From TrEMBL:
Similarity field: Belongs to the glycosyl hydrolase 12 (cellulase H) family.
Range of residues in the leader sequence: none
Binding site for Ca(2+): D7, D23, D24
Protein name: Glycoside hydrolase family 12
Lineage per the UniProt record: Bacteria, Pseudomonadati, Spirochaetota, Spirochaetia, Winmispirales
Organism of provenance: Winmispira thermophila (strain ATCC 700085 / DSM 6578 / Z-1203) (Spirochaeta thermophila)
Complete-protein stretch covered: 283 to 366 of 366
Residue ranges constituting the Carbohydrate-binding module domain according to the UniProt record: 3-84
Length: 88
């Protein structure tokens, strides 16, 4: 299971189980830069459970190498995650 690097903003739609990594999360307080998901079985980031929950990027601790390691699992065509900036 290799973590595939991606850049923000990032979203994914549909079923499957995927491993992604990024170093692009906000580390300063910004309630506009968030992660959200729905209809997932699992969304874990650095061992923290965010499955189907809204969280600001700055609330998610990085790993000790400065990356965020994301494990996604969904079983539906409308399973979804997004990691992005609030448009307003
Ligand atoms: Ca990057
Ligand atoms: Ni605008």
């Amino acid at each position: 299971g290799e973590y595939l690097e991606m850049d923000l903003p990032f979203s994914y739609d549909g079923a499957g189980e995927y491993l992604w990594k990024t170093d692009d999360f906000s580390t300063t307080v910004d309630w506009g830069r968030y992660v959200n998901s729905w209809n997932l079985d699992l969304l874990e980031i650095n061992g923290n459970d965010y499955t189907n929950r809204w969280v600001a990027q700055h609330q998610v601790p990085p790993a000790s190498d400065g990356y965020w390691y994301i494990h996604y699992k969904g079983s539906l065509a409308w399973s979804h995650v997004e990691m992005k900036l609030e448009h307003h």
